[PDB]
Amino acid sequence: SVFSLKIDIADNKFFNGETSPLFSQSQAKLARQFHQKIAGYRPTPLCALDDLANLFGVKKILVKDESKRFGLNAFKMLGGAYAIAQLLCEKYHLDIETLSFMTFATTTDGNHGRGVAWAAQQLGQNAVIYMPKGSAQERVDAILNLGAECIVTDMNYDDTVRLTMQHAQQHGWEVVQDTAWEGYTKIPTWIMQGYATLADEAVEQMREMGVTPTHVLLQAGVGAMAGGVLGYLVDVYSPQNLHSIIVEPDKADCIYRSGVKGDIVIMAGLACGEPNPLGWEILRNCATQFISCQDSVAALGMRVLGNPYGNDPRIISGESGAVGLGVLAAVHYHPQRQSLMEKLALNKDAVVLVISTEGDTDVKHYREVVWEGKHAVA
Amino acid sequence: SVFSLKIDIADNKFFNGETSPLFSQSQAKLARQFHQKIAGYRPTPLCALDDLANLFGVKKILVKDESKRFGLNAFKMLGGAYAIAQLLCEKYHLDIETLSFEEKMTFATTTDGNHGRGVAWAAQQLGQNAVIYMPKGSAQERVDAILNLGAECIVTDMNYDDTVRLTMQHAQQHGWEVVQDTAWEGYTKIPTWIMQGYATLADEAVEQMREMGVTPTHVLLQAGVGAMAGGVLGYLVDVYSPQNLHSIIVEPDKADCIYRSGVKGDIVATIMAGLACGEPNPLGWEILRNCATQFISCQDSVAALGMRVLGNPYGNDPRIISGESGAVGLGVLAAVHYHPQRQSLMEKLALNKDAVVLVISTEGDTDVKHYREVVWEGKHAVA
Ligand SMILES: C=C(/N=C/c1c(COP(=O)(O)O)cnc(C)c1O)C(=O)O
Ligand SMILES: C=C(/N=C/c1c(COP(=O)(O)O)cnc(C)c1O)C(=O)O
């Protein structure tokens, strides 16, 4: 069927190609050295969707399956656990190379807090995690399952973030929040560096395949992952020879609207309000294009990934996890496919990296989308 | 989420447990012995959906995956190829139990997809001709499938039943051999063999369940005219008896001929192409009237739900490619599960924690276009 989903593409006019040594090969190698020493480490699968590539008119679609990231069903773990380890290695005067085996506070709509909760349990320390209203019970239960304190509020994530701040300064907690703001940059920097492990894995995995990625699609909420992963990839592949596309939901396209203006200006995980300044700076510098897409584009991605084409490997991907792949699928069935493919420079030679950032973190919603066809194309 | 799709259940008030000797274990053995002699024969997988059965509160959900049947993506050839070989054994006075390899005959049938394909393929394999007719609105991909076997295919301006009559006429006019998977006045011999040919899948399924050490308490059988249901249930009740099998006949809302025949006790467009019905198959009807426990008339979206559930399995369950007509049996189980009145519907269907439910996935993605519209785009969604 032919259908038109909103997929607004805008060229980054503020692109300068200025890389960030702060997020590079060397730091990601230190970040990966850390994660390698964690019990049950395994590089997550880089799945080759060959038959879907041939159907879409490109050479390779390659998906980093972050649903395999230990038992957490998401990638976020990579940042939080690294920053928590760095925070202690600073406070207790140690070297990050030795990994011998008091309270961390944060707001999350799901994955980030689970990462912080898991790391706290692993290191014997405590964790208090705040969640906004409407958040799934399964996601609350998973945080309590790790032995942390989880409180569901009555206000939105941006308002809830203030509550975590006022509580942590009044009780004595250490804020391990995945976004930066004036007077708070140290931890988010480490988080973004910790994320780069997945890009480091994917690069080693791509070299083993013997391919060179021409494109990358990165979903963005506050842009911490996009920033950290893009900054690494452009350090490896150059900002000029990697066509990076940042993907945001229609109702929370802060980074898109920021790229549109120049200055700083739905699926849980990709909600924004205010963009992460550390992330923004990298995307403003090195991101090729920004996409603002409809809600149902993510839903499509989940279905395409969960029921693959031909003989491609199946991938379990959540709403925020599947939106990059969804863009490619929405472009394929769009009447303006030709001009959309040209605008994104997607052609028979395009090798496309996609990051599946989470699995079925909310089973109820996941199965409502893929079985019931909630948020259908129609 | 919680949702209500139309799933009307009717007890078969005319059940009497009279089996049919024409559809038994011995005549399924002869069928399967014939199929084993054909190149590329492999029993189709019986997939255990252990995690879905857990979710649904039953013991076992086992799906016979007929998408794997001889590269044809459907089960229908099991009958077509068997009838055709039997006809050749009448024409050349040959023994079927002995022959295997190889005047020009022409085989003619109406189909809305799979039957004709099964016929066309068999004519190709035996170096004969096939002329296949198709009702208006038939998927171009299915027209192409038949042509790609070296057979003629014509898409008429008429419905299924009228196209069948045009096939009859043209066959008399040209001297063709009509190979139709339905019966009527003066035409019962071939659709008997066709029905006997289908029992091969049930024979395999019974053997496979035995290797697993299970015994089915339930079978869900989708129906168009009821040749498959009739042929398959007829064998199954010879194995397990009509009384020990809770057999449920599944039909689409817009073409529930066997359901409507069920409530009355006499012979009386859907997204489930294959399950369309104008007039029921009287040969299949006799078996269903007799041994079918219940009939289900259901909404089109029930098949769509089944398709999605099968193609994106729960937990660690095996993935199955299942088409619109192929998935509706499973779709019933999934529709009941999410229904507000789940408990009562489960009780009605006598489904509990011990139920070993056999489901027949009768075809894979025979219409790739529609299949992906269901499973990717969410066409015919619950809401
Ligand atoms: C805001 C959150 N979500 C982040 C997230 C994102 C967005 O990451 P950034 O906030 O770093 O853009 C993408 N994909 C998945 C699966 C995610 O969980 C959070 O975990 O609290
Ligand atoms: C009418 C056709 N199909 C019937 C069919 C049926 C219904 O079988 P009966 O017509 O024997 O009821 C079930 N499943 C699939 C995949 C089918 O193709 C045909 O192949 O022409």
At residue B362, the 3 state secondary structure works out as: coil
- Please tell me which residue in A60, A76, A312, A360 is annotated as part of the active site: A76
> 3-class DSSP state for residue B198?
helix
Whose structure tokens read 């274990």?
Answer: B25
Q: Does A307 contact B304 at a Cβ distance shorter than 8 Å?
A: no
Distance between CA atoms of residues B196 and B183, nearest Å: 14
The alpha-helical segments, DSSP class H, found in chain B are 25-36, 50-56, 77-91, 114-125, 140-147, 160-174, 189-212, 227-240, 257-264, 282-291, 300-311, 324-337, 342-348, 368-372
- Please give the Cα distance from B273 to B352 (Å, whole number): 31
Q: Pairing mode, if any, of strands A103-107 and A174-175?
A: parallel
For residue A196, give both structure tokens. Answer: 């780069």
Select the residue from A5, A309, A368, A371 to test the B interface by mutation, using most B Cβ atoms within 10 A: A371
B320 lies within 8 A of chain A by CB: no
Whose structure tokens read 């906004």? Answer: A132
Cα three-residue angle B342-B345-B349, rounded to 5 degrees: 135
Residue B341: how many CB atoms within 10 A of its CB?
12
> What distance in Å separates the CA atoms of residue A115 and residue A205, rounded to the nearest whole number?
24
Nearest-CA distance B311 → chain A (Å):
6
Three-state SS at A121:
helix
Q: Which CATH class is domain A1-74+184-378?
A: alpha beta
Residues of B in contact with A368 (CB under 8 A): 1
A343 in active site: no
Output the six-digit token pair for B249: 């006949």
CB-defined site of ligand 1, < 6 Å: A 74, 76, 108-112, 219-226, 269-270, 320-321, 357-358
Distance CA B204, CA B208 (A): 6
Q: Six-digit token pair at B123?
A: 């004519």
The CB of B76 under 6 Å from ligand 2? The reply is: yes
Instruction: Tell which atom from ligand 2 comes closest to the C-alpha of B222.
Output: 13
Distance CA B6, CA A27 (A): 58
> Of B330, B326, B335, which Cα lies nearest the Cα of B317?
B330
Domain B1-74+187-383 coded CATH 3.40.50.1100: yes
Q: How far is CA B193 from CA A177, A370, B32, B371, in A?
A: 71, 40, 12, 31
Does the CB atom of residue B7 touch ligand 2 within 6 A?
no
Beta carbons within 8 Å of B263's beta carbon, 6+ residues apart? B10, B13, B295
Helices (H) and strands (E) in chain A, counts: 15, 11
Residues making up chain A, counted from first to last: 378
Note the resolution in Å, 1 decimal.
2.5
User: What is the fold of A75-183?
Assistant: Rossmann fold (3.40.50)
A1, A314, A373 ranked by CB distance to B382: nearest: A373
Q: What angle is formed at CA A27 by the lines to CA A26 and CA A30, rounded to 5 degrees?
A: 95
- Look up residue B51 and give its amino acid: D
Residue A83 phi, psi (nearest 5) = -65, -40
| Sequence-ordered list of residues with C-beta below 8 angstroms from that of B211, at least 6 positions apart, any chain | none
For B344, residues 6+ apart whose C-beta sits below 8 A from its C-beta are none
Tell me the pairing of strands B294-298 and B7-11: antiparallel
B312 contacts A372? CB cut-off 8 A: no
The enclosing H or E element of A244 equals: strand A243-249
The Cα-based distances of B128 to A210, B88, B108, B153 in angstroms read 50, 11, 11, 15
Task: Give the residues after which the backbone of chain A is interrupted, taking a C-to-next-N distance over 2.5 angstroms as a break.
Answer: 101, 265
Residue B374 per-residue DSSP state: I
For residues A352 and A245, the answer to whether their CB atoms sit within 8 Å is no
Q: How many whole angstroms separate alpha carbon B156 and alpha carbon B169?
A: 14
Buried b (16+ CB within 10 A) or exposed e, B104-138: ebbbbbbbbbbbbbbbbbbbebeebbbbbbbbeeb
What CATH class does B75-186 carry?
Answer: alpha beta
Contacts of A184 (CB under 8 A, 6+ apart): A175, A177
Distance A109 CA to ligand 1 centre (A): 8
* Of A121, A96, A94, nearest in space to A104 by CA: A121
Pocket test for ligand 1, best of A112, A140, A254, A305 (most atoms within 8 A of CB): A112
Is there a shared CATH topology between the B1-74+187-383 domain and the B75-186 domain?
yes
How distant, in Å, are the alpha carbons of A81, B27, B72, B201, B232 from that of B197?
Answer: 62, 9, 16, 9, 9
**8 Å CB contact of A377 and B378:** yes
Report the amino acid identity of residue B232: V
For chain A, the domains span 1-74+184-378, 75-183
B87 Cβ contact partners less than 8 Å away, ≥ 6 residues apart? B105, B177, B179, B190
State CA A101 to chain mean position distance: 29
**Method for structure elucidation:** X-ray
Say how far apart CA B139 and CA B367 lie, in whole Å: 7
